[PDB]
């Protein structure tokens, strides 16, 4: 008797509220063997639950390309650009700057426990991670970065797994 429209309206509101509040609960940073920092769950997440936003600076593809080239000139700067399609254009969330936000610290796997989704709030796209399966406390959060480039895989063989 949660009709379709209502289940939809409630889910939209729930997600919007989480994005807007920026509460990043149920997660902690840890050093992960072979990966640098990573994020570990400190509570159970159920399949379909919001985990965290991939928060950063929203930019357009031409600007993103320029930045990517600039960051590449500094070996101390990591790789935090997340490209995606929205309304017939390509955008990028640039999470390169060190902030307190956790989404940018989540590592890669092809057998991860989170899935990235596009969620728009009044015309502004947001990238969010949702649990793809039940996640137990103590598990490292992981999702598929999606970079299948030969050059990327050559430089970072971990992208293949």
């Amino acid at each position: 008797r949660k009709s379709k429209a209502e289940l939809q309206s409630e889910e939209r509101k729930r997600i919007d509220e989480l994005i807007e509040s920026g509460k990043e609960e149920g997660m902690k940073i840890d050093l992960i063997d072979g990966k640098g920092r990573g994020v570990i769950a400190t509570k159970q997440f159920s399949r379909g639950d919001f985990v965290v936003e991939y928060h950063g600076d929203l930019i357009e593809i031409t600007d993103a390309k320029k930045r990517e080239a600039l960051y590449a000139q500094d070996p101390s700067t990591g790789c935090y650009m997340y490209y995606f399609q929205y309304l017939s254009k390509t955008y990028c969330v640039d999470a390169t700057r060190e902030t307190n936000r956790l989404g940018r610290l989540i590592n890669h796997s092809k057998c991860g426990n989170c899935q990235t989704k596009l969620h728009d709030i009044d015309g502004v796209p947001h990238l969010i991670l949702i649990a793809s399966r039940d996640i137990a406390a103590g598990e490292e959060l992981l999702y598929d970065y999606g970079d299948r480039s030969k050059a990327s895989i050559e430089a970072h063989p971990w992208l293949k797994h």
Binding site: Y82, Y83, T116, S152
Partner: peptide, 10 residues
């Protein structure tokens, strides 16, 4: 160097 790319999940 790498990036991240989202693939269609409408």
């Amino acid at each position: 160097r790498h990036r991240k790319v989202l693939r269609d999940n409408y």
